[PDB]
Amino acid sequence: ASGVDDDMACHKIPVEADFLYAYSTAPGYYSWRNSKDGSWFIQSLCAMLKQYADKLEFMHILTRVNRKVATEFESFSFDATFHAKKQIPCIVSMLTKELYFYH
């Protein structure tokens, strides 16, 4: 097969490639933070990195962060509007390879 949009003589990659955005919350949602222990996301991210950075690929680590935040945290507020709310982090990957912090 052959085409007009493949196998270019001069190899290029997107200028937007190789970026990864680890968002604390889903698009359009508030992000929760405990005034004493820190944000649910950063707390969880650090904990998972500490425990798995030398054992798992980055996306799998972030998936563990997603589960920790989703299951272990729920807001507490005297304002019923903001009470008992949940949060799910959002991994946005435009990476082109697996990422391990170790080698």
């Binding site: 990864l20 820190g38 950063i42």
Partner: protein, 146 residues
Amino acid sequence: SGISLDNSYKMDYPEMGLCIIINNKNFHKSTGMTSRSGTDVDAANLRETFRNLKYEVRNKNDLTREEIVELMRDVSKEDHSKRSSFVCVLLSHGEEGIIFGTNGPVDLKKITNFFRGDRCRSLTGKPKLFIIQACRGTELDCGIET
């Protein structure tokens, strides 16, 4: 040599790279934004965590929108040739696609553009990670019983 697959980023350069942490706790009264209690705990946790991952951590506190842009531009103009990756952690108030400086908003796009594959050649082909702790809107998740 034997079969080479290239399925994972080369992370064995001399340096893992920079980990820039922007910690905005106090905002200008003129903005009407409240302080972010507990963010210092996040900043410290991040510094220790990435230190252990061998990153060159640089922390900055309470940066105006101008300082955020200046900092990012300056960092993107450094020679990252011997660095395996780049990490930036943003801790602040925010809205969809926006991160707040102490005196106003900053488009995330403006920040990340400095690191585009064509604008920061020493990072081309290398993982550029942006960790963002900030709101992305005003929706609340009521959750569901499992």
